[PDB]
Design a protein around this ligand. Sequence first.
Ligand SMILES: Nc1nc2c(ncn2[C@@H]2O[C@H](COP(=O)(O)OP(=O)(O)OP(=O)(O)O)[C@@H](O)[C@H]2O)c(=O)[nH]1
Ligand SMILES: [Zn+2]
Lengths: 135, 97, 62, 246, 476, 112, 87, 560
Amino acid sequence: KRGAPGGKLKMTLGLPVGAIMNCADNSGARNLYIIAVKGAGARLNRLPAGGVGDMVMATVKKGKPELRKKVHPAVIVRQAKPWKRFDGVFLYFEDNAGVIVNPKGEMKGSAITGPVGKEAAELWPRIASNAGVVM
Amino acid sequence: ASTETDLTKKKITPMGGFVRYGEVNNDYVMIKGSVPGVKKRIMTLRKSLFTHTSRKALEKVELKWIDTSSEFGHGAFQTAAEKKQFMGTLKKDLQTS
Amino acid sequence: AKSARASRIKENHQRFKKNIAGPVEAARLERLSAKLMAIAQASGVKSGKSIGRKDSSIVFPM
Amino acid sequence: MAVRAQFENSNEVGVFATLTNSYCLVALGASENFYSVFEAELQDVIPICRTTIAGTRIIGRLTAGNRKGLLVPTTTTDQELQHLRNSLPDDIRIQRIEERLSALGNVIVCNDHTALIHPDLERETEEIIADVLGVEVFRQTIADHVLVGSYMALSNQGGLVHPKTSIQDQDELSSLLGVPLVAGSVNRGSNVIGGGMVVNDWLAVTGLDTTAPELSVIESVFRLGEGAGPGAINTSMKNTIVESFY
Amino acid sequence: TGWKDIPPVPTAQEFIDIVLSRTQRRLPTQIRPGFKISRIRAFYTRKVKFTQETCSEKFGAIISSFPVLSDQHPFHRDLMNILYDADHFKVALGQISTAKNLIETISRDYVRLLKYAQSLYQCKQLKRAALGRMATLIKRLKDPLIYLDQVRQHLARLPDINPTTRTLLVAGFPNVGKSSFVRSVTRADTPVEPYAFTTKSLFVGHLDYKYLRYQVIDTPGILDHPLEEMNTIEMQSVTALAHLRAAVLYFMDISEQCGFSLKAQINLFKSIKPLFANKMVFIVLNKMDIKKFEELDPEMQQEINDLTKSGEVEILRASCATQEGVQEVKNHVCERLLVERVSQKLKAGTHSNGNIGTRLQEVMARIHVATPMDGTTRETFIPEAVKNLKKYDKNDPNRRVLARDIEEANGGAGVFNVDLRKDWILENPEWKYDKIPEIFDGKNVYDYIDPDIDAKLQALEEEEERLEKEGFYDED
Amino acid sequence: MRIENCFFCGRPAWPSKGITFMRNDGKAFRFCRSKCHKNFKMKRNPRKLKWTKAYRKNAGKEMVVDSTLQFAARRNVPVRYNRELWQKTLKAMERISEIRARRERVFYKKRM
Amino acid sequence: GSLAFLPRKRAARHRGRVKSFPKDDPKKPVHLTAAMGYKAGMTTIVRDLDRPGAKAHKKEVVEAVTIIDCPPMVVVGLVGYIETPRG
Amino acid sequence: MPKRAVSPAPSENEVDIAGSLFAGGFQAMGLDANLLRAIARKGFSVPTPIQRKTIPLILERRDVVGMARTGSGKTAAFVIPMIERLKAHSARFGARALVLSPSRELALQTLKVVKELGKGTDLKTVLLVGGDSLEEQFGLMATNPDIIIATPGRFLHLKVEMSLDLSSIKYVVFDEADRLFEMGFAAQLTEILHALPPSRQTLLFSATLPSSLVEFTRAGLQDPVLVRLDAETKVSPDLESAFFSVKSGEKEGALLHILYDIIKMPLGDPPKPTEHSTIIFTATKHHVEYISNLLRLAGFSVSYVYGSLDQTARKIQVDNFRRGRTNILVVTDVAARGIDIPVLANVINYDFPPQPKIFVHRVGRTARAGQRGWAYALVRESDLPYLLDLQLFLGRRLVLGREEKDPSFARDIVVGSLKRVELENNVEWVNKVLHENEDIGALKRVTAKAEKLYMKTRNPASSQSAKRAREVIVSKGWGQLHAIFGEEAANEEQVRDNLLSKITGYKPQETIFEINKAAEAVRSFRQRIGPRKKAPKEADKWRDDYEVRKKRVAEAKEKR
RNA sequence: GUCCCUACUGAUGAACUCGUCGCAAUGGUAAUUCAGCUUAGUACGAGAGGAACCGCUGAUUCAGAUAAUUGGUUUUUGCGGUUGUCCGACCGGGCAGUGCCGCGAAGCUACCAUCUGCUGGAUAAUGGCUGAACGCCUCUAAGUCAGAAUCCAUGCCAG
RNA sequence: CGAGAUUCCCACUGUCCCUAUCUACUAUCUAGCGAAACCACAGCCAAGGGAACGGGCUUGGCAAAAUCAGCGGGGAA
Ligand SMILES: Nc1nc2c(ncn2[C@@H]2O[C@H](COP(=O)(O)OP(=O)(O)OP(=O)(O)O)[C@@H](O)[C@H]2O)c(=O)[nH]1
Ligand SMILES: [Zn+2]
């Protein structure tokens, strides 16, 4: 199966292609570079945008020398762009954060720093498992 | 506007009346979603030409409450009673009384 | 994906119409017509029973 | 007796469910396969509560509790608290707690006797945990991982622990708990035991991708089946473990 | 993993028809004499280049997709060699390369010719001539395509074993009962028809043995030929027996019903003995029910015991007809195989040095059992109900209701609506199916729920009565 | 559904009203309006701001004490359903509402 | 834009023509097919969703809903149409 | 997206010793007293052969092309005579010495060497690298340095911006010219060469001599003298060699077998190189990552250094290897020529080099100063022709399998097969890892695609090499055991494999289909193959630190 | 070696007495794809793996709408603050082609928000029924059944 | 107020866009005055019209006054 989440409601996607977001897990990366969003449609002149709970291709531009300049899938966990939730609640995060994930769903890291979105936690079970704060 | 969940005796019209329309005292129809036209305009309701093909129809609806805060601003007081109770007494009202 | 006008989808929609929405809309219109009725009840030529005349591009002028 | 079941298609039955001695909580789903598997394993001996916490699917990782009580976070609503209270019998206490660590199942792992908490847990939260759950609490990490509930699981008969835990760490952990412990893997080697499975005193539910050797070692450690396995069975078929896990 | 994902290859006429169909259909086709000569040559050279490209891509897919004989495990290389002559396969897959390369050579040749073409008829005849060259090349390639299609079909319909994994081979003379044994031990369909060469190919099944996978292979059989002359079926049999690192079972029967003398089986087994010397081998006396191990002659017993004398051989009895000992023999042989595998695994990592491997450290970490120093066992809460309820059985008619059956009766996944009200437990039953007030006068009814609120209201009313006596609302 | 209390502005924020912003250490703020959202973003002190309910509270302008104010508290232990309990709660809600109205009036009366 | 709605024309009548009514069969009981009101505005509601198979099933859902003020309508006439080869 | 986005970052390391067609103390070389004192303070007591051979030529003012590995002292070799020629700061406006280096790190290293060796002199040295302020570089040029150390692109940009006159430059140095050409600086290098006056002394220091570099030197240098690091191509007699014919599906397991038994490497972190010093040279960076991860899973102390690796990361890895914190070093070719490699004891080439001379360089990387070294090769059927080109280049007799009882592993090229039992067990464990952990499987797929691309992009062998490769494959020695496994082994496998040789040499009588039109085609085909005979924000009153922030704003306003 | 005519659309429009409610010839015509649950770890399968129908729920693109709620925009110059200048000073002013800074209604908006997107017949490849040519046979010759996102119309827009 | 403790950014470019600032250029209606270029006669479309010649002509499609605003079709080497 192609790496596109299934069963996701609409939201205000706020992470375009080529975005410097900060890293969440203890893999060692300091930031991830959104370069390609998996599952985005094919529209000309439209920059693919991603939201919480979507696996996005990421490249470590700043990080530990072991993990630097490395491309692997990663899923968005926190977005500072305001989005609404089916209980009619508009919310947004302080930063833009994602955790490095393999295409099946095994996260390279072990602990997730900071809070975790309910959308990411619900769409991916182990993010809920290894996430210490989800709100 | 009162629903079984909240026994708050109020009409469908929020605080201050509808903006640019007024206050309704009649039978009214509350329908989901955005609907073509603007305020004061005649709206023609009619039956569907064909029998329905989804559970969205013949899905029974149970309501909780209806937003009655003033739409003329970013108000959060549904009823004048709760508003005059929460704000307390004001000097102009005290001088009038 | 099958088109909205596909024969299979049309047949399934007809089955749904005849088996599911049918009785619900029937009972709905039954109570509606009942309330309609509640609200509603809430010489031949000289009498007008025989229909007469009131008060030509089909035939050529004569 | 451990059965392999899928919530929808995910093997993290521990993530989508919390199971204790006197009750078991199942998430609301489009289907009743998962609830039906639990009732099949438990034909109405204890209540099965179809619960949602804070409008979330992840009840297993968003609640933590034992027989004596259940703990749910601030984020849940009054409707859901009333759901838990009314569904749950009178013998069982239910409490909503205010913690920066919302994942209560993750930061809290507990049994009818003991409990383990996150290193950074608050003192007031610790004392409310203690008096609500009627258990004693230690502070400990599992293989240098802070999420004890996800990375490890408890049962009064025995426990399964993070695979990479050192021998000395496992020994001290087993001594402080007072129950037998074994380090092993679940869900075809998934490192997350607590997320992978949920276990009560007399049965277990795992994912389908769990292999037969780890199913057997789970049986032995948790004293399931006929109780023939206290772990001496694991030592007897060590050879199977050696070949499979080499 | 196998070789089924090998794309089909067409015959000569087919490949010509499809290649010419692509070059006809996928490109513009109309050109005019009034058009510029440069555009004419561009058109025709584009046609030629497209024909080259499609032919080259198809031949490249074919070659790079067929298996590379001398990079596979010796079992695989010799098995595909006996099934399919390796030298001849290789000369075929050769001709096809040389043919494709000649296609590209002709491609450049006619590209220069078209580039220096001077007229529409020039381009006409040049393109016709080039496409004729490729057509004739495939026409000569007619037979290799058929051969490669046949080898593709079989290599697709070829059993896929794992030489490394725990394996048990079953060998012997034909009609001894190998197929009967393999059907008894595993869930694999092998023809049990009673004629000499019933199975012309290796058959494969699988079993579980204390939660461990084993693969059982049934081989066709071997006669008294001294391996210099053989049928191809016996050759694939001996290749399996020689290159499959596995436990070996040799099935022989005391009754000569198989059609070979006990001396004949003895000679065959001593002939194949060096091929099995490294391994563990198990001679199984089948059909003991019709002819037991006692009644045959004492010197026959003596020679079979002299065969037993060696230390890497074992003797077992079995009767596949009634399944007298199939479970016991499989249990025992696989147990010894498991013990040997454990020994090898220990040695790999116990190699001389003094430092244990990281995998070995992990396996000790896994096998280690934790136990409290105090030696106390916590008291447990198992209830008598779940002690004496009945086990859940799907075929059982007098069954529980099940939420699944309620769902299926009342619709399906998206139809049935679950009702938590039936699961609600309340003091007064008709409490259920009642709405619960939530908000009232803009203040939360739940947040203001509290027991003894009657007494608290009485206290508040006393306080208000005291205030009223104080005149706490008078105007001055 | 539960009527939130606005952090900065104080007022009883309603569903579909206001925005929610939570900060990574783990704390969530519900803002009734963009006005209070922006006032909290700009690092203003709600104590310093005069229109804020909590300033009106700390200044003593809005009454601080009394059993009615101890009645308003977030409850943490749930209770089994009972029509009688809920209906006596509702009549108590009316009774408390008139309590709060009269006592706010008289508190302002002694303020002036 | 869509070709079914172009060229962009003004509405000839401010009211709005119904054009098509539901098909008639004699078997149903009698009923009117239409009604009129006036768009007053919209409000917000929250609802206990009862959509089986939905992610937000049995959860609070916030929606926007139009209010149409609908005073009782008065019957003042009947009309009889005949079917003809010209409609 | 960024998988081979542009190209495999390590392309190849092409060398052309045909560039040879171009043609004991410091006090004995008689340098100035101040330069001698600076050298003594730096600690250069005995000159290494590279500067011992080059400095007299540079003092004699001859153009120099120097074949020298990194770390031999090339920077000192071309700076000492430069300082000895300069001897003072010139009052006339105009730069006199120019050095062009690929990267800013190497430029900084050269700058540090220049400063340390010219401590005391009034020479003005400048650094012009990318990322620095153009205004600062303008100011430095206004201060008029005598020595310039720069990258080609930045130097060209500054020259174009300032209309700089280079007619006063008499000393030109090209540091790491092969790296310059690999990075593609050739166009602006030629532009700078054209801009420079003809009357200049040119030095070009490189580890390798590609054909493009040879052409550039021929076009731009006036009678260049080629100095080489002594016997860099002469294979040391103390080098022992063993080559193993291995299949692709068993090849990782064969590498593990060599590491486990042939070397008897300890597993785990080790308790100045080590006693084992296992280095592995591969073809692609994907191969480097795959092998490194597999070996760390196996339990080795592995440091990996590949071509396009981050500078700090490569320094940390090289430091770990040189200090003995790791025992294996995994490199292809580019990082190998880039980094400083100490004396090694074990060298293994995973992917066989295309060029015998690349092989010679990789085997001269070990067995130095009379110390014995070991070299193991993994050679496939496709890699055999390159092995044959290598044996022609080395002039060593070929021993296939066990044709000789005691072949000389140092003087004779000995090729054999590895032990079947341990080979199969390592293959099994490799397959188990590949099936279990998905990351390694993804690495396997990407390194397989990279290997396929490398097969397409690799330089081809000779027709005759292909020929006697066919006859070697026909010969029995290809499948026989290597001579290192023991005469008792030879005994057992000779007792056995002979009937196994008969099995492998089976000519089937008829195909199974012969056992239709397809069958008729097969029969006719058979008859045919019948063999031939920033100020703070304005203070807000409501803000808590209102007065403090107002004070900060006032202080910033006063500072301006 | 260099500004003309007119088709078309929209908005108007003279006379047919003015107005209301209608009909519909004609012209255009609109929906597309993917995903998840169940079926189901089932059919199949030596293993590995592994479907489809029915039913349900979402998402992409396109199209027509709308501002309940959330961001954005402030000749509402609304409220608060504030910079320097001169009129000797207060004063109120010119002042900075509307001074700047905070919050801000209404309106307008947003792939930065929400809603909606529909049914009958006839067909093409093909699969058939009956049955001649041709005493067997045959989907075809006569008669005829099913069948594609196809076509034609309804639903929709103009009138 | 706490040496208070912790977190984010700062580079260059002979690269692109936007916003901010400067200079310059930009303005409508009604009254009154009031030209010039150009003009054989007029301009719907399709096919045909030997000579790449169509606005005439043949056969058709069709064809309803008059304004304002957009819009696209024609005019040898
Ligand atoms: N009575 C008896 N007959 C057996 C037994 N095992 C095999 N047979 C006979 O074997 C016959 C079938 O041959 P297989 O079972 O296939 O023996 P095989 O060694 O596989 O040889 P093939 O027939 O060529 O496949 C049956 O008809 C049986 O009569 C046994 O245990 N008892
Ligand atoms: Zn506010």
